[PDB]
Design a binder for these strands. Structure first.
Ligand SMILES: Nc1nc2c(ncn2[C@H]2C[C@H](O)[C@@H](COP(=O)(O)NP(=O)(O)OP(=O)(O)O)O2)c(=O)[nH]1
Ligand SMILES: [Mg+2]
Ligand code: NA
Ligand code: NA
Length: 327
DNA sequence: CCGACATCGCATCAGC
DNA sequence: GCTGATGCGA
DNA sequence: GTCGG
């Protein structure tokens, strides 16, 4: 359903969601406002009344009243006032710097740091992550066209195989689902010599090669299974510079790899469907394993998985291509 | 009435 | 110094 | 904030 259908309401709702998360630190109300925004964004009718909205799962009494106020007046008094509040609106904004969450934003605004200029004057008060996110504030909100993602996949798959031809790397995320643009790049990495029961240099070596061919330009965090960093395509001769992009690489054991691929392919809207669909068959699936429930409820040992397809066979579900997986 | 509401790796903090 | 708690992104 | 035990 198009935006102009209920876009007024979902924008209200997402705005209320962010103020809950970033200012009031009410994460559950943040998820509430998003559950309603999402169920409403899919509702294929221009909502005429808050009561009409309340029929949808996740829209309850208090949101329904906000939809009334918005429909009568075109605005929400509480949101207008908060949008004009210097403190709250500053707190809310600085959380757009990756590395600054609600807690650090509030503490910056407490001491009167309120803008990117204020963050630039006070670099010594930022951690490493925050400086990188500050450095790339703009770049990080630009989206990645599939053409650039493909070029990025070319570099990643090539340099991984060049380190060790026995690595398997899959670029997951929306990209894997045909998405015409992406928000970041999500790489899963596995290797024969890495299993549930079993060097720590396996991930570090892949990061090192991508840093050495100047693909990876900064490191947000790094450990033995999860990498969070920044990358950029080489510049096309005299032509312009690409944006720096968010890239994550994570190392998964061989026998947990396809559970990971499915998990980190998403969408979450599809993913939680398929673990509750799916719970009926007496199976539970986290990112790692699939296991059987369980006649009072005891999960058994994890069942072998050798393809993304297998986890569809256990559930007696039709295999779904990544491309048909937005829900 | 009143609690659940994804879950996890990693960086940094509080506390010992 | 080490462990555990907390913030953070996703 | 919403849902539901
Ligand atoms: N949002 C979210 N996704 C999760 C989570 N846990 C696992 N996933 C899964 C579901 C996600 O689909 C998958 C990829 O991670 P992203 O980069 O966060 N989402 P995508 O790449 O699809 O969209 P975009 O192009 O804008 O980056 O990981 C979680 O806690 N939150
Ligand atoms: Mg992605
Ligand atoms: Na309802
Ligand atoms: Na942030």
């Amino acid at each position: 359903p198009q935006e102009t259908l209920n876009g007024g309401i979902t924008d209200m709702l997402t705005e209320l969601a962010n103020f809950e998360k970033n200012v009031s630190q009410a994460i559950h109300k943040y998820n509430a406002y998003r559950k309603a925004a999402s169920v409403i964004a899919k509702y294929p009718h221009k909502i005429k009344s808050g009561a009409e909205a309340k029929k949808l799962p996740g829209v309850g009494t208090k949101i329904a009243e906000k939809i009334d106020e918005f429909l009568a007046t075109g605005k929400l008094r509480k949101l207008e006032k908060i949008r004009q509040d210097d403190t709250s609106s500053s707190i809310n904004f600085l959380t757009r710097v990756s590395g600054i969450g609600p807690s650090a934003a509030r503490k910056f605004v407490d001491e009167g740091i309120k803008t990117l200029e204020d963050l630039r004057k006070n670099e010594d008060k930022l951690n490493h992550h925050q400086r990188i996110g500050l450095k790339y504030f703009g770049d990080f909100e630009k989206r990645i066209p599939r053409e650039e993602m493909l070029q990025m996949q070319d570099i990643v798959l090539n340099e991984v195989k060049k380190v060790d031809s026995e690595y398997i790397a899959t670029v997951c995320g929306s990209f894997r689902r045909g998405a015409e643009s992406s928000g970041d790049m999500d790489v899963l990495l596995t290797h024969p010599s890495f299993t549930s029961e079993s060097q720590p240099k396996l991930l570090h070596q892949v990061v090192e090669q991508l840093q050495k061919v100047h693909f990876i330009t900064d490191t947000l965090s790094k450990g033995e299974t999860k990498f969070m960093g920044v990358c950029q395509l080489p510049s096309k001769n005299d032509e312009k510079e690409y944006p720096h992009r968010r890239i994550d690489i994570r190392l998964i054991p061989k026998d947990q790899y396809y559970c990971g691929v499915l998990y980190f392919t998403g969408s979450d809207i599809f993913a939680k469907n398929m673990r509750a669909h799916a719970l009926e068959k007496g199976f539970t699936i986290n990112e790692y394993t699939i296991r059987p429930l369980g006649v009072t409820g005891v999960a058994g040992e994890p069942l072998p998985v050798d393809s993304e397809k297998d986890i569809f066979d256990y559930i007696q579900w039709k295999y779904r291509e990544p491309k048909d997986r937005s829900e």
